[PDB]
Amino acid sequence: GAMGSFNSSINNIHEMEIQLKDALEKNQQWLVYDQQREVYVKGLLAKIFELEKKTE
Amino acid sequence: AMGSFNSSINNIHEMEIQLKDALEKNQQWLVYDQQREVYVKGLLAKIFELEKKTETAAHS
Amino acid sequence: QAQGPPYPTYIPP
């Protein structure tokens, strides 16, 4: 216990904390990564709009 | 007073809420990514199809 | 097992 389980338990909480920080980072990366895909999407839609004027 | 130690204990409890909540989120990103790529490809397909005598693909 | 994007900048398919 003392030497102990407690110590391992503390480390185990430390892993939990770095795991939280990691996840929060990766989610932020996803946000930016997605924002850029939206820029691409909007461009794609602008392109389609223009392309559809020649179909007229 | 363990009141200072006690408070530290639930901050840890909260930390593993926020953790649990981040992973659920991170999971949501993964499915969202999969859905958006389908969207982009469909938009690309629209363009490809739409490209009527203004561009040309499948070219050896 | 949290995962980030394939890479930091978006690259279209």
Whichever domain contains A13, its CATH number is: 1.20.5.1180
Cα dihedral across residues B57, B46, A49, A52: positive or negative: positive
Q: How far apart are CA B48 and CA C11, in angstroms?
A: 18
CA A23, A28, A33, A38: dihedral to nearest 10 degrees?
Answer: 130
Which residues of chain A are within 8 Å of residue C9 when distances are taken between CB atoms? Answer: 33, 36
> How many independent structural domains does chain A possess?
1
Resolution, given in Å to one decimal, reads 2.8
Q: Which domain holds residue A42?
A: 1-56
Q: How far apart are CA B12 and CA A50, in angstroms?
A: 55
C-alpha distance from A55 to closest chain B C-alpha (Å): 8
Solved how?
X-ray
Flag whether residue A19 sits within 8 Å of chain B, measured between CB atoms.
yes
Which residue bears the tokens 């980030």? C4
